[PDB]
Amino acid sequence: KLVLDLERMAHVPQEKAGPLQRYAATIQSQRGDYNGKVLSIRQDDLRTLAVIYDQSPSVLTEQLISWGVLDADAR
Ligand SMILES: Nc1nc2c(ncn2[C@@H]2O[C@@H]3COP(=O)(O)O[C@H]4[C@@H](O)[C@H](n5cnc6c(=O)[nH]c(N)nc65)O[C@@H]4COP(=O)(O)O[C@H]3[C@H]2O)c(=O)[nH]1
Numbered sequence: 001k002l003v004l005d006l007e008r009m010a011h012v013p014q015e016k017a018g019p020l021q022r023y024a025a026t027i028q029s030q031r032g033d034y035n036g037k038v039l040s041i042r043q044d045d046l047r048t049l050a051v052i053y054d055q056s057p058s059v060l061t062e063q064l065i066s067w068g069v070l071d072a073d074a075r
């Protein structure tokens with residue numbers, strides 16, 4: 001399970017924040033979960049985020065865990 005902590009997402013360094021924040025906003029909106037504090041995403045979404053961020057998926061996963069946005073279990 002890939003679960004994003006939206007509160008922590010507000011504290012990702014501003015240089016990296018935009019794309020992830022829009023991607024989460026859009027999924028949350030499409031689901032109609034406007035009041036949610038956390039957001040599960042598809043495995044395919046993590047691979048898409050790796051492309052957007054030009055990172056190895058392992059690196060991006062570890063980054064998102066270090067920022068507290070993904071849980072350790074995401075590994
Ligand atoms: N529990 C569960 N239900 C699933 C899953 N996949 C699809 N569904 C259900 O099937 C719906 C239609 O899926 P969709 O055509 O992909 O249409 C989806 C999709 O295009 C997009 N969306 C929603 N959530 C995500 C997401 O986490 N990631 C991505 N990439 N797109 C999403 O917004 C649409 C509307 O989402 P919903 O209103 O939630 O409506 C979803 C949802 O009720 C799943 O892996 N698990």
Ligand SMILES: Nc1nc2c(ncn2[C@@H]2O[C@@H]3COP(=O)(O)O[C@H]4[C@@H](O)[C@H](n5cnc6c(=O)[nH]c(N)nc65)O[C@@H]4COP(=O)(O)O[C@H]3[C@H]2O)c(=O)[nH]1
Nearest residue numbers: 001002003027030031032033039040041042043044045046
């Ligand atoms: N083709 C297809 N596959 C399905 C469907 N439902 C579930 N799966 C598969 O089963 C996995 C787990 O579903 P989940 O526990 O609901 O766990 C899902 C779920 O909580 C949520 N999710 C993903 N997409 C949607 C969505 O469109 N709507 C909603 N409400 N939740 C979603 O994100 C989690 C992870 O998504 P995935 O990595 O894709 O991982 C999904 C996906 O591979 C479906 O209707 N169609």
